[PDB]
Amino acid sequence: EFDWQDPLVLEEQLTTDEILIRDTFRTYCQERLMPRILLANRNEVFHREIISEMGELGVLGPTIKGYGCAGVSSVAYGLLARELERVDSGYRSAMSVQSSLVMHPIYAYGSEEQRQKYLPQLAKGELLGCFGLTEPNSGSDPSSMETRAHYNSSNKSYTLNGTKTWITNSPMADLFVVWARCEDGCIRGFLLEKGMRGLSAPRIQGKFSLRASATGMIIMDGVEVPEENVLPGASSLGGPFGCLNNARYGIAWGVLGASEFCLHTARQYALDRMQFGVPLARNQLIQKKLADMLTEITLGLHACLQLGRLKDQDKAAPEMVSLLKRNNCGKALDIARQARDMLGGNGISDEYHVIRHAMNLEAVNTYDGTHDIHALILGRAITGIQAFTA
Amino acid sequence: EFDWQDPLVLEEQLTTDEILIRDTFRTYCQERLMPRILLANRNEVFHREIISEMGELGVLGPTIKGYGCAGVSSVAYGLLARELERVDSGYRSAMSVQSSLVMHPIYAYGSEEQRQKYLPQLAKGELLGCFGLTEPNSGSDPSSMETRAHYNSSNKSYTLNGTKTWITNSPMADLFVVWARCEDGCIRGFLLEKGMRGLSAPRIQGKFSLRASATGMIIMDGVEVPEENVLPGASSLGGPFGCLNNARYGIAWGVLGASEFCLHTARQYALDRMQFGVPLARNQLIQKKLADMLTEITLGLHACLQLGRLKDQDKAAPEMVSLLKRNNCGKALDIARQARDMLGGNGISDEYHVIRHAMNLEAVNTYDGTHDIHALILGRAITGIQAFTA
Amino acid sequence: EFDWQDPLVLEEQLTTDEILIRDTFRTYCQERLMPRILLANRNEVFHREIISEMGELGVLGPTIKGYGCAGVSSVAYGLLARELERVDSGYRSAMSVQSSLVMHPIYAYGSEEQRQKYLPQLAKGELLGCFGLTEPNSGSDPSSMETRAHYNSSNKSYTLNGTKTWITNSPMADLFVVWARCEDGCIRGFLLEKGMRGLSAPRIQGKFSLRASATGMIIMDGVEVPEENVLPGASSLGGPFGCLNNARYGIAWGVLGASEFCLHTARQYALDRMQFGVPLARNQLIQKKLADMLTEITLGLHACLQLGRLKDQDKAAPEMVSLLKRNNCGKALDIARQARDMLGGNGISDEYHVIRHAMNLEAVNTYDGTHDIHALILGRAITGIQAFTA
Amino acid sequence: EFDWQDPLVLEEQLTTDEILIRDTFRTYCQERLMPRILLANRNEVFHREIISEMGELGVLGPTIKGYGCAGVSSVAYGLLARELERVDSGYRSAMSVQSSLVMHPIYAYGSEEQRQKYLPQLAKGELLGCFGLTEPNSGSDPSSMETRAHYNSSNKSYTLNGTKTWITNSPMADLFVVWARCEDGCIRGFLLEKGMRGLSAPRIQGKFSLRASATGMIIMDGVEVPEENVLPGASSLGGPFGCLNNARYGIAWGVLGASEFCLHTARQYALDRMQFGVPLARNQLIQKKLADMLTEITLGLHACLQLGRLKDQDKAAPEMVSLLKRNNCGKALDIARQARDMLGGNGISDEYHVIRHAMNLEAVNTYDGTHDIHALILGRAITGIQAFTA
Numbered sequence A, B, C, D: 001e002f003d004w005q006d007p008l009v010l011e012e013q014l015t016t017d018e019i020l021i022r023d024t025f026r027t028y029c030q031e032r033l034m035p036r037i038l039l040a041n042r043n044e045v046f047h048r049e050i051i052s053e054m055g056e057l058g059v060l061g062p063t064i065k066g067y068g069c070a071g072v073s074s075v076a077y078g079l080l081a082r083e084l085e086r087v088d089s090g091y092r093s094a095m096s097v098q099s100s101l102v103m104h105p106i107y108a109y110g111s112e113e114q115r116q117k118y119l120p121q122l123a124k125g126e127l128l129g130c131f132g133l134t135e136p137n138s139g140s141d142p143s144s145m146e147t148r149a150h151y152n153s154s155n156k157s158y159t160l161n162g163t164k165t166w167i168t169n170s171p172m173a174d175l176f177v178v179w180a181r182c183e184d185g186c187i188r189g190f191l192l193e194k195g196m197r198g199l200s201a202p203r204i205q206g207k208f209s210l211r212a213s214a215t216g217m218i219i220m221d222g223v224e225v226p227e228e229n230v231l232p233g234a235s236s237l238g239g240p241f242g243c244l245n246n247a248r249y250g251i252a253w254g255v256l257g258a259s260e261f262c263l264h265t266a267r268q269y270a271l272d273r274m275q276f277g278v279p280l281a282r283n284q285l286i287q288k289k290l291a292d293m294l295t296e297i298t299l300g301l302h303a304c305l306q307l308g309r310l311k312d313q314d315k316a317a318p319e320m321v322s323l324l325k326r327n328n329c330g331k332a333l334d335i336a337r338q339a340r341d342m343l344g345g346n347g348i349s350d351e352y353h354v355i356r357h358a359m360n361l362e363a364v365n366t367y368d369g370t371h372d373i374h375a376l377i378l379g380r381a382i383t384g385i386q387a388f389t390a
């Protein structure tokens, strides 16, 4: 009565909707995404339409209520990210930006006029957006960004100058949610649209992680923004940090799908591939690896489930999320690399996919709070002493 | 709103009874057990009465229904083991034998007459019992034991010959649940009482793990047992293996309390102890360790909770238990050793307790299924191929 | 007086020639190789001429005496592989095949006529060769290959049928050293030249490890070979296994250069990159990583040195080599991945090179004896019991 | 031709004297020490005479030239510590204090009159000494000690006040080398003899690491010391730090013997113990562990050898020593704990010794520079930035 696929029966913890939604999306993902990832990753190609398709399914901004969004549960959101990542992290990352970094902040930090004007086209996937916070000289420490926003008392607008780098989707984005430091001192969020004079978004080359995903920069040469494009609901670092957490949530769930995919591939291979006369799966050294992969996946899953619930009850704290994101991203990296080892030579071929996952999770464990950073966050919360600096 | 003590709010997952019970026992444990462990461990002493006290609280065999037992939930059982281990593994191990290895098998594999005759005195703690399965030449492989049970057609009894070693409580036990291989081939369970001619239970010396716990052997020199002392409900290896799992459950929860105790001690020490002018807790190297300890504890807890539930629904499988026991025992070992490192020189003094825990969890990760064994169990269940032998 | 670059003074252990040679090659490597690896790796390109250049330097088959080879020391050989790998593993792998897998076997297992005819053009780099042993269904277990070699009593030749896969250089090779199982039972080595009817060497696509290196297969459709092309000095698995060890030697040294390159890049970056107002190198979490990288590199180096010496004294045993190859490849993998983490986002860009190394060492730890395999080899030698099968 | 006992042939790197000395001592150690460690450790007993015996062999202060000392090589010193630790770390620790912490500083920082007066009785083992630096509030940071030494212009002496804790041998010491902070600011070294009014050396209880070794404190209640008892050759923290390094050297070698002992015990046990019908040594999971133990031991050995040489050439730097001490102590801890796991239940019995080693190396990795501390030392030397504080 044991099911290595769902050891602790996560299924009897989901609601029939959550279940339907999961399955439904898994069908889109396997049928429409999987058949197009081998080359999308090999030749660094992001199929814009992918967003549009997700737009019809109504998977973009699924937790938001109204404005054409599903208004589904956090768990369902996690389940969704898990199916998407089971295919490719780059893909899930596009969806993540759109959902938690572009929509959610507009929805919770914007004026009603902003929401009305944008949320709908975002949900439909007519507007591909991006979250521009990171800078060449500001990564783990945002209180160090250089993008400044000056105010034109006369014209009723701000003028932004700065460079954002490593920004997902930026290259083929229509709406840009840029964060700059103002004259008052507080950093705010500005909404930018492509076509604005001064705004250019070159693409980054030589990526060897998240290749199926478009990544570029945001260069602003005196880009004039109207007052009505300022996010009226976020006067400081909490704007991005509030959203950031919503993103980390999706990531905690996500990486678990990539792990499960590596697990299932290794397990099969071990049964299918024979050496020394028998199937690899018959060796102790092979079984322990599978034992450990499954164990960490399971532990993560049920943790994620729990958090999903607490979230919907508005009882989720930033640190809780740091904990699962930090944990799940590290474990998912080992699992990938282990899987890669078990497939031997074949393992280094993208045609066996595992290599793609190892590579992708390399960035996932780096972005949205490096591994060690999340450790310090947890340590601050546990000891009460700050350990990020001197 | 983050509580490093209960990151994911395990509390809102417990029932008011489970909570009361927990607290209630924690009071007995802190008030009656803690003040007596420093020396009990230093001088290898097991305070028999400890059982009697637990007998009044009705903590022995808490899940059994009737026969004077609480008939409480599996979760409450786990919570109980967690509070006991938070003090000392040896202590929790005594309680574990009594509960899951002596009572549970009698209750589920005995005749009604056996239950009526024994369960009550066990629950009251008037009868200290022990589980004798392991032998000098049979540890991980029980299908290799040498204790044989011959049948006396004439006298209506069996004659047992064999040696069981490393048996918890045996030295001061009144009832012995011994498993021997019969003539039919199937191995059965025999009930032995002290005083039987032929039965001797010397004690083992030189233990440097689980010292506060009594450990001895079971030597049987033609010990004649009446037919009515044979466990009529277990015709083979499933008798011990069925019970074994119930024991592993308690252990999965247990080790988590020992970890939490090490965590809380290190955290404090790090805040209290200063070096280089500041509190140790101010260093990154110290914070990451605390970060990791807390993370593994939390993951385990919520997993254990889940299993506790599935158990009461009769949906718990042996492998599920192997998974948590294997996982939790390993993580709890690292956590101990880490804690020990963080207290520096003091860390090697039993007066700081951590050393005691590192030592104790050394046996916990070894007994009731070594770490690698549980790995093979999981691998068999995952690949479908046996990897214990050639 | 401490030099983090050479902690234990490996320098005062080298001979002035070994030193000259090292430096000399390091100049070719930095000047001629480094400036061409960013794209060679990005677009999977192997600059054939690279061999020719190494041919002029006389670095191909450096230990062989006569036939136009340097006849230098094993240490110098290791030093050479270390400088080459400091650039790219793919590059060093090309040189490795040529040296230890194509030349050495011809030199030690061939007739004089074979040596005279081939060694010279190989050393000059006029003949690019490859070692074909691995098969689609034979990887860790060679006693399972399917390439059969039948004998033509009439024509005085053999006919080979089989497929070799994952063969380095095969795509642009002139000489092929193929191993096939004969009718007698013993497996022998056959020399094949491009142009032979029946022999085709397609290339493998989708590599995401050792991209700057050409990898293809060896398909033989009744490829007729003259008796004079059979390696008269190797009647069984010891032919490849004898050479294999000579290859592993070079690899033990090699991976150490890739590690040092990752170390030097991280160290600099940590000093150059600032966050939170100071240089990353000022954080404890960053320093420990650097501490560990350096420690493992050093340990490996001096071990390699020692073995190099024992080798020249003909006192090197297969297991010694397994030990360093196994050890060094694993440690060099962690070091890469760590380095990659420390460079954050940039770390995922090939323009920062570390990513290339992590990827490359993924194959190095897989080929020429997987990590776990070398473990079993060591275990056999230590316990005297074979543990590869049932 | 492979010898798992000496993989890389360390033997052909030793001089016939070094070899004789090694063997000679190994005979004393096996014949006189081993038969007395089971109980010495069980009942916390230090056989004072042990020093006297080592005194006759002339093993105390072996590198010092003259004054009745051997004046042997650093390598021979390491070899000596390795044989001693192969028995018990506590034992080797006694010898270490005597040699590197009591004698060496007197010899290199004392006046000739001091050397003449003490070195001889120390070498003979007539004077058991101890190194008192650590304090209750000063462990990793010595620049924080509280023992002050005031000067009596009138009497020509100093008055010391302070407490030193965790001091090896102190309980049965005749000579005390105490370090206190003077009025000038510089910390100096004072020589104290038992019987001095004001000086008391109680013993510490509850040790569960290095039990066979005596450990106590040094309480000084206005202990008046003559000017002639001040170490004229050490005006600051470099006095202890200079000696400290000489101690770490011995430790780097030492822990390697304890590892080898655990390795040899596990290997045998694995061959001797059978489960599932065969010897444990026949399982892959068991072989990999042995593979890893041997690998780390070997790497350490040859590193230690090298350093030994550089030392005698006066080319050893503090960081080199930190590197091996840090490395070897950590690896020797894993090896112990692994060994302990492999012996299952028996493993928790001191009669199988491994448990004793795991426990002992717990303190070794803590004293003379914690693991993380040595990491920061290395990081300072590598980046040039101090990371011990804010």
Ligand SMILES: Cc1cc2nc3c(=O)[nH]c(=O)nc-3n(C[C@H](O)[C@H](O)[C@H](O)COP(=O)(O)OP(=O)(O)OC[C@H]3O[C@@H](n4cnc5c(N)ncnc54)[C@H](O)[C@@H]3O)c2cc1C
Residues within 6 Å of the ligand: A097, A130, A131, A132, A133, A134, A138, A139, A140, A141, A165, A166, A167, A168, A169, A209, A210, A215, A363, A366, A367, A368, A369, A370, A371, A372, A373, A388, A389, C273, C275, C276, C280, C283, C285, C286, C341, C342, C343, C344, C345, C346, C348
């Ligand atoms: C595929 C990909 C897509 C991305 N998409 C986006 C996007 O859409 N929007 C956006 O805003 N950003 C994006 N980023 C960038 C990401 O948010 C930043 O990489 C991350 O917040 C910070 O790291 P960094 O690259 O600046 O490196 P750093 O901050 O310089 O850190 C480098 C290393 O130093 C360590 N470190 C840093 N500070 C400390 C400290 N105080 N103590 C100890 N260790 C420290 C880290 O743990 C890490 O190992 C993306 C990156 C990748 C790789």
Ligand SMILES: Cc1cc2nc3c(=O)[nH]c(=O)nc-3n(C[C@H](O)[C@H](O)[C@H](O)COP(=O)(O)OP(=O)(O)OC[C@H]3O[C@@H](n4cnc5c(N)ncnc54)[C@H](O)[C@@H]3O)c2cc1C
Residues within 6 Å of the ligand: B097, B130, B131, B132, B133, B134, B138, B139, B140, B141, B165, B166, B167, B168, B169, B209, B210, B215, B363, B366, B367, B368, B369, B370, B371, B372, B373, B388, B389, D273, D275, D276, D280, D283, D285, D286, D341, D342, D343, D344, D345, D346, D348
């Ligand atoms: C404090 C303490 C109390 C105990 N109390 C009891 C009690 O009350 N009742 C009772 O019945 N027993 C008891 N035991 C013993 C316990 O149940 C046995 O130790 C355990 O089932 C088996 O291990 P073993 O000691 O026989 O060693 P082994 O079975 O010999 O195993 C030794 C090592 O070998 C490994 N190993 C074994 N087989 C294999 C394989 N096929 N493949 C790969 N690795 C393998 C293990 O992982 C372990 O590291 C106790 C032990 C301690 C230490």
Ligand SMILES: Cc1cc2nc3c(=O)[nH]c(=O)nc-3n(C[C@H](O)[C@H](O)[C@H](O)COP(=O)(O)OP(=O)(O)OC[C@H]3O[C@@H](n4cnc5c(N)ncnc54)[C@H](O)[C@@H]3O)c2cc1C
Residues within 6 Å of the ligand: A273, A275, A276, A280, A283, A285, A286, A341, A342, A343, A344, A345, A346, A348, C097, C130, C131, C132, C133, C134, C138, C139, C140, C141, C165, C166, C167, C168, C169, C209, C210, C215, C363, C366, C367, C368, C369, C370, C371, C372, C373, C388, C389
């Ligand atoms: C870039 C690159 C270049 C190469 N170039 C060459 C070349 O020039 N010439 C040539 O002959 N070959 C070459 N190879 C292939 C290499 O020699 C083989 O990959 C290697 O010997 C065996 O692994 P495999 O790929 O067949 O996988 P497998 O043998 O199937 O092994 C797969 C996994 O199973 C494990 N495994 C296998 N058997 C056991 C067992 N009994 N017990 C426990 N675990 C086991 C391994 O540890 C590994 O993790 C190359 C590979 C790469 C990736």
Ligand SMILES: Cc1cc2nc3c(=O)[nH]c(=O)nc-3n(C[C@H](O)[C@H](O)[C@H](O)COP(=O)(O)OP(=O)(O)OC[C@H]3O[C@@H](n4cnc5c(N)ncnc54)[C@H](O)[C@@H]3O)c2cc1C
Residues within 6 Å of the ligand: B273, B275, B276, B280, B283, B285, B286, B341, B342, B343, B344, B345, B346, B348, D097, D130, D131, D132, D133, D134, D138, D139, D140, D141, D165, D166, D167, D168, D169, D209, D210, D215, D363, D366, D367, D368, D369, D370, D371, D372, D373, D388, D389
């Ligand atoms: C059996 C035994 C014998 C001993 N014998 C002697 C003797 O003969 N003579 C003598 O002088 N001393 C002796 N000592 C003590 C030893 O020298 C000290 O334990 C050691 O120098 C320092 O640690 P501590 O105990 O004070 O703990 P601490 O210095 O308080 O350190 C505790 C923990 O904190 C960490 N830590 C400390 N500072 C930092 C920092 N800045 N950043 C990050 N982590 C940090 C450490 O890594 C360790 O894990 C002995 C100890 C034992 C256990």
Ligand SMILES: O=C(O)CCC[N+](=O)[O-]
Residues within 6 Å of the ligand: A092, A093, A094, A096, A097, A101, A131, A133, A134, A168, A247, A367, A368, A369
């Ligand atoms: O780093 C960030 O600011 C968030 C990235 C979210 N994502 O999935 O790309």
Ligand SMILES: O=C(O)CCC[N+](=O)[O-]
Residues within 6 Å of the ligand: B092, B093, B094, B096, B097, B101, B131, B133, B134, B168, B247, B367, B368, B369
């Ligand atoms: O090994 C066994 O058979 C069970 C031990 C249970 N316990 O807690 O001592």
Ligand SMILES: O=C(O)CCC[N+](=O)[O-]
Residues within 6 Å of the ligand: C092, C093, C094, C096, C097, C101, C131, C133, C134, C168, C247, C367, C368, C369
């Ligand atoms: O696997 C092999 O047979 C050897 C590979 C050598 N190399 O460096 O590519």
Ligand SMILES: O=C(O)CCC[N+](=O)[O-]
Residues within 6 Å of the ligand: D092, D093, D094, D096, D097, D101, D131, D133, D134, D168, D247, D367, D368, D369
């Ligand atoms: O910590 C110290 O000051 C040195 C200890 C040396 N030793 O072997 O006990």
